[PDB]
Amino acid sequence: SYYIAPRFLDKLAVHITKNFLNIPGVRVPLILGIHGRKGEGKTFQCELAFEKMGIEVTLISGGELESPDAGDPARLIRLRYRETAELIKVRGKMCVLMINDLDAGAGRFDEGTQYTVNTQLVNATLMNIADNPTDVQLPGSYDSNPIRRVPIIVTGNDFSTLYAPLIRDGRMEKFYWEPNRDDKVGIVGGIFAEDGLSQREIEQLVDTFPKQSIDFFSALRSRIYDIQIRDFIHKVGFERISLRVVNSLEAPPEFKKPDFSLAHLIESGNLVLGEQQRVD
Amino acid sequence: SYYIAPRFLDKLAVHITKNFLNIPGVRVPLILGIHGRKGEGKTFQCELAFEKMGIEVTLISGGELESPDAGDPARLIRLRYRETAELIKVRGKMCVLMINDLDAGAGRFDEGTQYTVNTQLVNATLMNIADNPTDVQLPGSYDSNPIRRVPIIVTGNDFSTLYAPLIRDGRMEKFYWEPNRDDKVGIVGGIFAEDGLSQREIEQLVDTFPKQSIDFFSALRSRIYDIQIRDFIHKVGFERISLRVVNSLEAPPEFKKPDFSLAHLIESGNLVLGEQQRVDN
Amino acid sequence: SYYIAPRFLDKLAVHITKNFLNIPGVRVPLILGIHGRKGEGKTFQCELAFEKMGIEVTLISGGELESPDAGDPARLIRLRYRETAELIKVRGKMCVLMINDLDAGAGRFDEGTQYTVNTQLVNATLMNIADNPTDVQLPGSYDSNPIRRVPIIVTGNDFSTLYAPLIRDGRMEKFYWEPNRDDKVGIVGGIFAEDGLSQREIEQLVDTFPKQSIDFFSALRSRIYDIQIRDFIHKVGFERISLRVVNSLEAPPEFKKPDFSLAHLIESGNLVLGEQQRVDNSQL
Amino acid sequence: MQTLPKERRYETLSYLPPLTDVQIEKQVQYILSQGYIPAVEFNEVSEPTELYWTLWKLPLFGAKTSREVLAEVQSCRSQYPGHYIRVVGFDNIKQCQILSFIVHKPSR
Amino acid sequence: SYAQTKTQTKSGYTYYTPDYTPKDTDILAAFRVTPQPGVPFEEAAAAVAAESSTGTWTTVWTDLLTDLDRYKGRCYDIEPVPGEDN
């Protein structure tokens, strides 16, 4: 029931549609890349959009091709591209392959500041697919028969300089997604829709923290049981909190549905602000 | 006899209980991070809180997270996690894994500093356990059996120098430690509890040195013993002080409890400040 | 025959003996750090002190704390600590591990200077041993066995360029050494004790050159022996001076004690001061 | 003088007194130190004629510690209490088995 | 921009190879190769050396019980035919 921003949906629609469409005289970028701040919800929006459209999605982890002890990215991206192409025929629906954190989540500090051998391989593989999308080749069992072209989505914080050729060529399209007031109200409104908050209340939350990530507001819901747990500990007592809960056959702890008010959310908001401030 | 701050106690108790409790819908972070200033009572207080509740602790050293073998420290963490996971199923009580001083193990000091592949792997491992705590397996095995969830306690000096994806709302609950006036009075009061000081006197001691770490009071406490030992060395003699203290078949030298007066302690406190000031200059 | 300052002897005697004694309800710092200006007698007076009390020393160089293997300088400190712990059990005497010139081992100077992981891990390891003296382990060998506590002595020029949490009152006892007039007179007097100078003469030597380290006065004696040695080289001849010091089956050359006077000592001291000034007032 | 009793034997290390869990740990440690691949085999009957034993799972190509091998033996032992179980060590360069010894016999 | 030079510590631990020098006890073969359009020259040569020897692109549990470099044919030289395309 989560809200999707109209702009985000439009950018996905046009890219997927145009690639699948067969209009002569027209050139289309195969790869689309989205860069934004962390916890903006780029991954979350992509997954939602595909469900509404009903189009099949193949997901490849950023850490799956960044790790030295994983395999071969060059052999992997090719294999995933072929498999996605098979879905269109069998499934009879549009199929898209997307990558998350191409230059991130590896564990390395640089985050694309310094290139790696593995970084070079992805660039090489992607460039080959973008030039010749219709024909993609594995090491063995070369097939003469062409494959249906498949659109690619990529999300990150920023794009490396190695990709600059593709963008100048116009083979890659870069979309910068930043939330607005209207977008915030939608997303915040969707999260707390089940709780039941007035329109005026939702506006106040966004106004309290004008410059905040989308992830923060979602994280606020989690710290509602804290008061109950803290109070519960006292009745049981510190001496034997562990034993009863960890490995004892008794009735499981029961918590009444937390009351939802704006005051509680502001108090919780301040605490997370303070902690983030001190850490950075 | 040692005082634990209620703030510090309630923060630990909730995180550890919440991991073992199952509440539908709520996403609970696995790791708790305690960070602050040096010698403010981060490691010491954790020990006290694990004694009162009476829970089993698995320790990992800070500088243990680098080896002359690739992969080896990353394998170390998974192994220690699974050992703690088994303990819950056997003993029938809470168990916790604490990595102390994680700032000097994984933390990037500065841009200049060059790192190996091991530091990459340790960040990569901790992200996996924080995502799939129930599904932890060793690299290259044919077991794949669901194991028990184990909460992690992490202590450091500066989290500003620590891999960015690790410090996330869903992944790690951070916590900043800084004792207040009341907190200081309680703790310092606990140190000098056997000495016998009035409430007013204890207040004055904190007021004299307000911008001080907790260890600073313990330093002067231990220092009110120097004169006695120095007198003992002279009487015995410098030529035979080793045999009289290491391989002696006699009775250990007793030391009468020195005078613990506010005026004498302030004098001693000024002396320690003077030592720090000399270094600072 | 050398004079050790009573301030320096007391500080060392107390810290070491305190660690071996187990006074109940007292938390003791494991590491003693001594810092001061260069050539003031930090290292030298330690070696005099350990010899007097007759206690065993294990030595770690400062420049030893870097190798092309990851976490290998960190492994060395643990190994050298355990070896010292065995000496107490077998020989039955006090033992001390000493790391000299730690400033050049695990310290960062500017911001430009690129370092390595080892610096980070050396500081990590020293904090651990200070925390848990009884529990020191080696990688690949995990055995539950307690070992005896060993005190550590550290010498440095500047501690400012060192990881902060490692220098705190609980973890390390700090000591600043800067000898006074009475300390100077005592030490310098101890060097020239055999020579035979009056009290007033020894006072004058310190007064003439007040802003000087201890090493200055020990370096002064070397220059008085120049004349005798130069004359010896000439008499033998430059051609065959080598086969008369290294591998010679003859009685070693003997030198008489030179005229140790105030006037002669002053002149020599002025010449050394000129030599120091020359390096300081250098353009490029 | 003493007459030798009739007893059935099981190749290597069968004449020594029954191996303790510490002793088996040391023998597996030898296999990993040389760089051989450890593998677990099990069989219903112990006969000199038969030379193939049914392989338990797959060879352990990525084994870092001897504890990982012993954990695989305990899994097969709990599953098959009445089967013989042995540990083998494959060498890739020589292309031959280097060590093979029995760790479990059918209980009662 | 700020560039730095460094010293480092080390942790420590497949068919087309032009660096290889042929042995006196080797069987050598010359092929006149014509690939399909859209196939590289070095890729086509590596395919011939693999398929005429052992093949084996994917490693199985049986393959790890033997040496892989010992029994393997390799391409060491590529020369173009004059006045001809691909």
Ligand SMILES: Nc1ncnc2c1ncn2[C@@H]1O[C@H](COP(=O)(O)OP(=O)(O)OP(O)(O)=S)[C@@H](O)[C@H]1O
């Ligand atoms: N609550 C307390 N009661 C009695 N003594 C305390 C207490 N808290 C701290 N201390 C003393 O001060 C020292 C502080 O120890 P830690 O808890 O290791 O400090 P820290 O915050 O972990 O310092 P860093 O950042 O790891 S160096 C202890 O060794 C005790 O001597």
Ligand SMILES: Nc1ncnc2c1ncn2[C@@H]1O[C@H](COP(=O)(O)OP(=O)(O)OP(O)(O)=S)[C@@H](O)[C@H]1O
């Ligand atoms: N007490 C003394 N009696 C006789 N000679 C001394 C005495 N103290 C110092 N000296 C001389 O001066 C030198 C000073 O040596 P150190 O003890 O290394 O000084 P230092 O302060 O440790 O040098 P740094 O700071 O490590 S470069 C000694 O080697 C002796 O030659």
Ligand SMILES: Nc1ncnc2c1ncn2[C@@H]1O[C@H](COP(=O)(O)OP(=O)(O)O)[C@@H](O)[C@H]1O
């Ligand atoms: N439209 C949305 N509705 C609800 N939650 C959202 C929405 N967009 C993002 N989120 C939240 O964002 C988090 C995931 O962020 P992610 O999609 O990975 O962002 P990014 O890729 O920009 O880092 C989740 O907690 C998810 O609930």
Ligand SMILES: [Mg+2]
């Ligand atoms: Mg600590």
Ligand SMILES: [Mg+2]
């Ligand atoms: Mg020195």
